[PDB]
């Protein structure tokens, strides 16, 4: 038995072999802050951007308390619960309080909005939303009001902040009570992907599963006690959460720094008073600090890690990282649906400069796959296929999505085109999948062509990526325009998504008007993209 349906456990044959192997420990995902606070109670584990600063003991206590607090409001045993924070540290105990409460975090970021929202809050049956009150001019507290409306189930809205008409976050506090544990074979938590498909898709990830994520990302990056860790992306992105993340630094026992914003005012302060030793960044925000370090007068000596992902960063600033910032360059390419790549910290540094990493697991398995779906030669691009003991065998109630997904054994389509070395390290070629990569955020061409259709002067929409020297791509929208209408220009059509509820990091660059698209009897976006030009 499990406690949630809607996904697809491992079949009992593999879950036995990750069992022995010593993936799967056996231990809830909370038992990472329970036992390091039990050996080292009295170590800095947070640091926010302030300067406050809480020791493991504290952090493990007050977890304890919000999640007696949430029980007193029947959050627990199983509900799925929508998280909305920016990177203070009001996001990492709850992130505990609500595993030790039975409740299922399902992680959002700060700048999704309404149409994002509302379908994760439907899909995942949510019954409680957490948000801040105001974050970067925009009340969020509006968008939970929204939410309610459309979602029945949202019992709870959380706000850290002025509440309003709903609950303090701080107020959800009680004295501790034993709670149960759950099983680690259980989902505990979902994470959220761009997905390729007209909505976007939730990932469970389990107690064991998640866990050694994070337990083997730890050993890959030399995370020990001594690691202070920055986190630049937002904190329920899977790179900057497990990948070792914050939680590979709670787990060895470092401290967990957590920075606004990646801008080099911010990072740059944070990483001189803290003394960061490693953070993880997006392309784009690696691009900036090497530029930065020309005209900022930080001392950034104490970084020994930097970890760039997310998309593929070139060459040439790669091999810029050691004289420019002082430290040592690892490349990941992960996803949050699993497998995990990253150069190792002795690699040779043509590896590094050259190549995103070589598969986390021992047991992760990779295949490399052309249009027919067979195996390529070796060292030929084709489709990355990938299975492992933290790989999902289905999104979350997605049955129809899985069907096209995976394959019949369990292998997960990544829509990546990579070529494999003969060390077994990868280098990303390209993409397969519709969704337009813009600086590390995933943008699910179906679902932005679906929302800039329902705009009433457009009939027909293909959203196309255009190459960016500095973001990797950028947004086309190519528009037919409505029967005897006309198509909206890029502000208006900007002006309308964002009232629509989406996402600003979905919003076209550029729009398009044409009167037909080419096709194959499909919208041929190889042949628009070129159409560009
Ligand atoms: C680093 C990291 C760690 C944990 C994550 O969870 C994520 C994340 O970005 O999660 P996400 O699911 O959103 O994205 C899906 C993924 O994004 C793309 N990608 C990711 N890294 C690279 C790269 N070094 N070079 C080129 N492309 C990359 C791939 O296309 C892939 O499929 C990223």
Redesign the pocket.
Known sequence: SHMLDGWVPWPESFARRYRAAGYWEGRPLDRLLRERAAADPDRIALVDAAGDRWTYAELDRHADRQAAGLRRLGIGAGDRVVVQLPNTDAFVVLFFALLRAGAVPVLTLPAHRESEIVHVAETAGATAYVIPDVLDGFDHRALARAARKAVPSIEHVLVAGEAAEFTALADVDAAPVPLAEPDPGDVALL????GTTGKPKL?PRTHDDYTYNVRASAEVCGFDSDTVYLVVLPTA???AL??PGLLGTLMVGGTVVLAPTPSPEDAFELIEREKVTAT?V??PVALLWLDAVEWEDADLSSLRLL???????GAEPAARVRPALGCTLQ???????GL??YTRLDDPSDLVIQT??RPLSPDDEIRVVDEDGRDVAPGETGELLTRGPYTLRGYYRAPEHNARTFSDDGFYR???LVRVLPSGHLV?EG?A?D?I?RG?D?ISAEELENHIMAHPGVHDAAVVGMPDATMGERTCACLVPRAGRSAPAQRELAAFLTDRGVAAYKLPDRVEVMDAFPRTGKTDKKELGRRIA
């Open positions: 994470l959220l992907s761009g990932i992105h899977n790179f497990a990948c993880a997006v392309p970890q760039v992902g997310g998309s593929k960063l490349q990941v390419f992960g996803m949050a649906e995990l790549n995103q990493g990544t829509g990546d990303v993409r999948k969704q990569n590390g995933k």
